[PDB]
């Protein structure tokens with residue numbers, strides 16, 4: 001039963017397995033007044049005659065849109081295999097550059113919230129055949145990106161129903177800011193809150209803090225610790241593997 005460590009080969013490429021296409025895109029950002037990059041995983045069968053859900057996957061501090069793919073995440077391989085095994089239905093995964101910096105901008109990681117919601121999401125929904133409602137939109141990430149997942153996801157429950165912060169960093173908002181209503185909206189609209197981290201990670205306390213608040217305030221969620229895991233992709237890959245399946249079970253790809 002999930003969550004659990006994935007079996008050997010979950011992140012390996014094997015002959016015959018259908019592979020999705022990872023495309024490179026650039027979109028205009030009203031948040032940075034510049035063109036920004038992102039990568040988009042289209043499943044092996046992506047057809048404009050069908051509709052797909054979308055997972056916005058965020059990298060760590062100083063990272064890039066390539067981190068979750070060739071940079072170590074192998075998100076496309078993990079997705080290809082789960083799809084081939086019938087573990088999850090086909091879906092689209094988008095990896096942006098989380099540091100929306102530029103002239104006139106003080107904090108690019110905070111500025112990223114508007115970039116994602118007002119520029120990247122509209123670009124994706126206009127160029128790809130995707131659902132545009134909260135029930136078909138998820139957000140997850142590692143470290144700094146896990147913090148942004150908590151921050152953006154919980155303060156925008158009308159946009160995301162599935163949130164997966166892995167090894168969330170100190171940029172994670174205080175509990176009072178994540179749940180300004182004592183967790184009311186969360187208990188009603190949150191379909192999946194998946195918090196994971198390696199037991200050896202020095203940043204374990206931040207995800208732990210949110211976990212404790214959710215326990216105290218009756219917010220359902222999944223809290224999974226990777227035994228012996230550190231601040232690396234041997235925690236983040238297993239994290240994504242579990243999140244995709246648990247989100248699927250929760251209805252992310254419904255229809």
Ligand SMILES: COc1cc(/C=C/C(=O)O)ccc1O
Nearest residue numbers: 060061143144145169170171
């Ligand atoms: C904003 O503060 C912090 C961010 C990080 C991010 C780490 C990562 O993305 O791997 C670590 C420690 C911090 O105090």
